[PDB]
């Protein structure tokens, strides 16, 4: 049904590296070519796979994976559940970046206006 | 004194990139290819990176600080800036986290089927 150029309605910009990668399929040639709805379908769940922070390799994997099984729905949400925990690690890791940040800045005296800085200083060494 | 690829002793690969942008200073002696505070300044780049500073953010913090009779202020300042970008990520993902919490419970009791309400979802 579609041009690509169209199908960049999924807010993909022109992408041969999803088929030349097997996620997105290969289009049908129409007079001539050259066209893609199953696909416009595989290409949002694709691009929102990725605003919910699943990595190209982990869509990949997934897509593999809930494309060969009969229980499809059951992997799904497995994936998912793993995504979650994902997730929350990051979560963490920004977290402890944040207490550095915190403790570093507690390293400040009371009068700030010198040229020595404790976070500076702490970060040179 | 310092040398090149031994400055690469601050954990980063051959940068010209820096000096090229101004963050980084640089000398020529027998005609080496020197760089010590350059050492320290380098330090500094790379910590602020691991702490979640952007290149940019680092370019203009560097132009302030470096001007600034109080850079322990400036860098104060600086460093709550940070830290609450680094809070409105967090929350960015947890709010991803919560409709991830939300897609996986739409899914039913028996799951051995062809039928995703996830992908589903996602799809239209
Ligand atoms: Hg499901
Ligand atoms: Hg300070």
Not at 36 to 61: A, C, P, S, W, Y
Not at 73 to 90: A, S, V
Request: hydrophobic share 35%; charged share 40%; with cysteine.
């Amino acid at each position: 049904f579609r041009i690509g150029e169209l199908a960049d309605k999924c807010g993909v910009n022109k992408e041969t590296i999803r088929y030349y990668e097997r996620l997105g399929l290969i289009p049908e040639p129409e007079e001539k070519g050259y066209r893609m709805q199953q696909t416009v379908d595989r290409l949002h769940f694709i691009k929102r796979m990725q605003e919910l922070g699943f990595t190209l390799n982990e869509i990949d994997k997934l897509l593999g994976v809930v494309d060969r099984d009969e229980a499809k729905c059951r992997d799904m949400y497995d994936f998912t559940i793993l995504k979650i925990e994902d997730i929350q690690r990051k979560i963490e890791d920004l977290k402890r970046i944040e207490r550095m940040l915190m403790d570093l800045k507690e390293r400040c005296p009371e009068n700030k206006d010198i040229y020595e800085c404790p976070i500076i200083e702490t970060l040179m060494k």
